Design a protein around this motif. Structure first.
Motif, PDB file in Angstrom:
ATOM      1  N   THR A 144     -36.630  39.657  64.549  1.00  0.00           N
ATOM      2  CA  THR A 144     -37.568  40.772  64.529  1.00  0.00           C
ATOM      3  C   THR A 144     -38.428  40.792  63.268  1.00  0.00           C
ATOM      4  O   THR A 144     -39.656  40.813  63.344  1.00  0.00           O
ATOM      5  N   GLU A 145     -37.776  40.777  62.112  1.00  0.00           N
ATOM      6  CA  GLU A 145     -38.460  40.994  60.843  1.00  0.00           C
ATOM      7  C   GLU A 145     -39.264  39.793  60.349  1.00  0.00           C
ATOM      8  O   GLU A 145     -40.388  39.956  59.874  1.00  0.00           O
ATOM      9  N   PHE A 146     -38.699  38.593  60.447  1.00  0.00           N
ATOM     10  CA  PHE A 146     -39.376  37.422  59.895  1.00  0.00           C
ATOM     11  C   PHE A 146     -40.714  37.083  60.573  1.00  0.00           C
ATOM     12  O   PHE A 146     -41.690  36.802  59.875  1.00  0.00           O
ATOM     13  N   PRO A 147     -40.771  37.085  61.922  1.00  0.00           N
ATOM     14  CA  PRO A 147     -42.084  36.797  62.514  1.00  0.00           C
ATOM     15  C   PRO A 147     -43.150  37.819  62.118  1.00  0.00           C
ATOM     16  O   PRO A 147     -44.327  37.470  62.032  1.00  0.00           O
ATOM     17  N   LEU A 148     -42.738  39.059  61.872  1.00  0.00           N
ATOM     18  CA  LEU A 148     -43.662  40.089  61.412  1.00  0.00           C
ATOM     19  C   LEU A 148     -44.091  39.842  59.970  1.00  0.00           C
ATOM     20  O   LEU A 148     -45.259  40.018  59.625  1.00  0.00           O
ATOM     21  N   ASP A 149     -43.144  39.431  59.131  1.00  0.00           N
ATOM     22  CA  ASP A 149     -43.437  39.175  57.724  1.00  0.00           C
ATOM     23  C   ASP A 149     -44.294  37.925  57.536  1.00  0.00           C
ATOM     24  O   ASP A 149     -45.169  37.892  56.670  1.00  0.00           O
ATOM     25  N   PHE A 150     -44.048  36.898  58.346  1.00  0.00           N
ATOM     26  CA  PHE A 150     -44.830  35.670  58.245  1.00  0.00           C
ATOM     27  C   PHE A 150     -46.247  35.880  58.760  1.00  0.00           C
ATOM     28  O   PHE A 150     -47.201  35.311  58.228  1.00  0.00           O
ATOM     29  N   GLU A 151     -46.371  36.692  59.805  1.00  0.00           N
ATOM     30  CA  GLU A 151     -47.670  37.023  60.373  1.00  0.00           C
ATOM     31  C   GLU A 151     -48.563  37.647  59.309  1.00  0.00           C
ATOM     32  O   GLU A 151     -49.716  37.246  59.135  1.00  0.00           O
ATOM     33  N   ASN A 152     -48.016  38.622  58.591  1.00  0.00           N
ATOM     34  CA  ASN A 152     -48.745  39.288  57.520  1.00  0.00           C
ATOM     35  C   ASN A 152     -49.107  38.330  56.394  1.00  0.00           C
ATOM     36  O   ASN A 152     -50.230  38.346  55.891  1.00  0.00           O
ATOM     37  N   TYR A 153     -48.148  37.495  56.007  1.00  0.00           N
ATOM     38  CA  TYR A 153     -48.357  36.515  54.946  1.00  0.00           C
ATOM     39  C   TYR A 153     -49.491  35.559  55.300  1.00  0.00           C
ATOM     40  O   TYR A 153     -50.348  35.263  54.466  1.00  0.00           O
ATOM     41  N   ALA A 154     -49.491  35.088  56.543  1.00  0.00           N
ATOM     42  CA  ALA A 154     -50.552  34.219  57.034  1.00  0.00           C
ATOM     43  C   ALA A 154     -51.905  34.916  56.947  1.00  0.00           C
ATOM     44  O   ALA A 154     -52.883  34.343  56.467  1.00  0.00           O
ATOM     45  N   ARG A 155     -51.946  36.163  57.409  1.00  0.00           N
ATOM     46  CA  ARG A 155     -53.179  36.940  57.423  1.00  0.00           C
ATOM     47  C   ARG A 155     -53.729  37.154  56.018  1.00  0.00           C
ATOM     48  O   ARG A 155     -54.943  37.125  55.809  1.00  0.00           O
ATOM     49  N   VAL A 156     -52.833  37.372  55.060  1.00  0.00           N
ATOM     50  CA  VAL A 156     -53.233  37.544  53.668  1.00  0.00           C
ATOM     51  C   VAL A 156     -53.907  36.273  53.157  1.00  0.00           C
ATOM     52  O   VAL A 156     -54.908  36.337  52.445  1.00  0.00           O
ATOM     53  N   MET A 157     -53.372  35.118  53.543  1.00  0.00           N
ATOM     54  CA  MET A 157     -53.933  33.845  53.099  1.00  0.00           C
ATOM     55  C   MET A 157     -55.240  33.502  53.812  1.00  0.00           C
ATOM     56  O   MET A 157     -56.162  32.976  53.189  1.00  0.00           O
ATOM     57  N   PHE A 158     -55.313  33.789  55.110  1.00  0.00           N
ATOM     58  CA  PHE A 158     -56.544  33.585  55.877  1.00  0.00           C
ATOM     59  C   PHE A 158     -57.693  34.365  55.250  1.00  0.00           C
ATOM     60  O   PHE A 158     -58.818  33.871  55.133  1.00  0.00           O
ATOM     61  N   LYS A 159     -57.384  35.592  54.850  1.00  0.00           N
ATOM     62  CA  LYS A 159     -58.354  36.509  54.267  1.00  0.00           C
ATOM     63  C   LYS A 159     -58.713  36.112  52.838  1.00  0.00           C
ATOM     64  O   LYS A 159     -59.876  36.187  52.438  1.00  0.00           O
ATOM     65  N   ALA A 160     -57.711  35.680  52.079  1.00  0.00           N
ATOM     66  CA  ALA A 160     -57.900  35.345  50.669  1.00  0.00           C
ATOM     67  C   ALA A 160     -58.612  34.008  50.477  1.00  0.00           C
ATOM     68  O   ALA A 160     -59.267  33.790  49.459  1.00  0.00           O
ATOM     69  N   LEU A 161     -58.477  33.115  51.453  1.00  0.00           N
ATOM     70  CA  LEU A 161     -59.104  31.798  51.373  1.00  0.00           C
ATOM     71  C   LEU A 161     -60.087  31.574  52.519  1.00  0.00           C
ATOM     72  O   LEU A 161     -59.797  30.823  53.452  1.00  0.00           O
ATOM     73  N   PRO A 162     -61.263  32.217  52.448  1.00  0.00           N
ATOM     74  CA  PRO A 162     -62.245  32.150  53.533  1.00  0.00           C
ATOM     75  C   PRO A 162     -62.927  30.786  53.647  1.00  0.00           C
ATOM     76  O   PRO A 162     -63.542  30.498  54.673  1.00  0.00           O
ATOM     77  N   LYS A 163     -62.816  29.965  52.608  1.00  0.00           N
ATOM     78  CA  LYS A 163     -63.489  28.668  52.587  1.00  0.00           C
ATOM     79  C   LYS A 163     -62.689  27.581  53.300  1.00  0.00           C
ATOM     80  O   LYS A 163     -63.204  26.494  53.562  1.00  0.00           O
TER      81      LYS A 163
END
Length: 471
Positions: A144-163
């Motif tokens: 339950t928790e890990f797929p939710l936590d990884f999803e957020n982590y991925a999104r943070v990186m997608f957003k932080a590294l637009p290039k």
């Protein structure tokens, strides 16, 4: 015997080198980095063969200018590296404080890379799970928790590294699952007959969640792509006159690779795995299946060696993870796969590389393929004088035959391979083996301040790809 008028590889064919964050960065507690499960694992006595850790490694965190200069000198067009989760979110949770310094570091790095004309290929998860997530809810064990936590982590990186256009979710989930929760040789060093199958399922769902977010919100911003990286060594029957050995060799590939690739491309685990594992192999909820099915823009492939496979007469035991087969380097007739390296599991077999490329293509409708890791260790290389370490002749030949085997697969069989990444850019922390095992094309003098000396193989790739790639 070479055709005079062949087109060769496409001009936009990517090639370069690959590293992992924990294996090279060091600076384990600098700029607010939290502990990963590998930080704590190395603290346990006898878990690392040479008693070392990644506390310093290659000190790549402080030498970003150096590594880029090195890459540019080797003619690398692309560079694959991973991002330390606990540098971004030190505790890892989706409600945990975000470390801007960690973000800025990689943000600055991508800029420096791009200015050198090198395309970044980023791995989100290369085994360095934040220790806190492991303690909070069992880490990778939590459905339950890990797929939710990884999803957020991925999104943070997608957003932080637009290039960044090229994204990788997980690197070799099998290696997180079985060595980490089955044999206990990797972090977090757990030993169980059920947990590896639980982890692998959670890794797939977490992957699918990240891919969904990426495709919906970030992918179309710069025409990007995302996929998972699966390892897998090819197989050959121990006794080809025995159909059971033929079927065993195929079954092994399913347990190694189709374990993750079949749910991603077909929708469920292989029947051979369900037969042996039964209730131990989780089932996809309608939601989980929606996340996983078709969650690969490209196929990320790690490949190293090949094996002879012999079927087993006795039933599969609970601790079995390979598919009830014997993994060998000699067949019944007495033929050997290849010569020895510093890795007991690795023996050069360039034909297997092409065979695996084709095997993947035929099974999954010839998808876009990126070779995100190729490489070899060298027997007794660590015992060599610096003068002779740079004479990477064995590794030169390895790359020369594997890359050419890839070339044949691409130009003859028509395997849709788009990129090749050599592992590794430099000698580094090879996990449980420590620094004893060297996979790098660049020698790192750990005793003299980790200075970088390009071995013979590092210089051989630029001319080789100039020959094989169109103008």
């Amino acid at each position: 015997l070479v055709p005079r008028g062949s087109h060769m590889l496409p001009k936009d064919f990517q090639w370069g080198f690959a590293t992992a964050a924990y294996q090279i960065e060091g600076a384990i507690d600098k700029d607010g980095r939290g502990p990963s499960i590998w930080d704590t694992f190395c603290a346990i006595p006898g878990k690392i063969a040479d008693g070392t850790s990644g506390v310093t490694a290659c000190d790549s965190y402080n030498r970003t200018a150096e590594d880029i200069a090195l890459l540019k000198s080797l003619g690398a067009k692309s560079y694959r590296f991973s991002i330390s989760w606990s540098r971004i979110i030190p505790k890892g949770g989706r409600d945990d404080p975000v470390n801007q310094l960690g973000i800025d570091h990689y943000a600055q790095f991508v800029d420096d890379l791009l200015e050198a004309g090198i395309t970044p290929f980023i791995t989100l998860f290369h085994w360095d799970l934040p220790e806190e997530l492991h303690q909070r809810y069992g880490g990778l064990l939590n459905r339950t928790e890990f797929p939710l936590d990884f999803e957020n982590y991925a999104r943070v990186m997608f957003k932080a590294l637009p290039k960044v256009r090229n994204w990788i979710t997980f690197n070799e989930p099998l290696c997180s699952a079985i060595p980490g929760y089955g044999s206990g040789t990797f972090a977090p060093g757990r030993q169980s007959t059920t947990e590896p199958w639980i982890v692998g399922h959670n890794l797939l769902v977490a992957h699918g969640r990240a891919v969904k977010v990426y495709r919906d919100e970030f992918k179309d911003l710069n025409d990007g792509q995302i996929g998972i990286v699966l390892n897998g060594d090819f197989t050959y029957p121990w006794d080809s006159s025995d159909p059971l050995d033929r079927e065993a060799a195929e079954r092994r590939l399913e347990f190694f690779t189709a374990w993750y690739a079949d749910p991603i491309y077909l929708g469920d685990y292989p029947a051979s795995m369900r037969k042996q594992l039964g209730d131990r192999l989780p089932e996809f909820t309608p939601e989980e299946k929606a996340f996983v099915l078709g969650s690969n823009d490209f196929y990320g492939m790690n490949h190293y060696t090949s094996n002879y496979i012999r079927h087993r007469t006795s039933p599969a035991t609970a601790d079995d993870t390979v598919g009830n087969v014997d993994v060998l380097f000699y067949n019944k007739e007495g033929q050997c796969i290849g010569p020895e390296t510093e890795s007991s599991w690795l023996r050069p077999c360039p034909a297997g590389f092409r065979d695996f490329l084709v095997w993947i293509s035929k099974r999954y409708n010839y998808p876009k393929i990126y070779v995100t890791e190729n490489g070899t260790s060298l027997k007794g290389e660590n015992d060599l004088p610096k003068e002779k370490i740079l004479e990477d002749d064995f590794r030169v030949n390895y790359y020369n035959e594997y890359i050419r085997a890839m070339f044949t697969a691409a130009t003859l069989d028509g395997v849709n391979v788009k990129g090749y990444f050599a592992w590794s850019l430099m000698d580094n922390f090879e996990w449980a083996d420590g620094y004893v095992t060297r996979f790098g094309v660049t020698y790192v003098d750990y005793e003299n301040g980790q200075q970088r000396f390009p071995k013979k193989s590092a210089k051989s790739l630029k001319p080789l790809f100039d020959e094989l790639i169109a103008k």
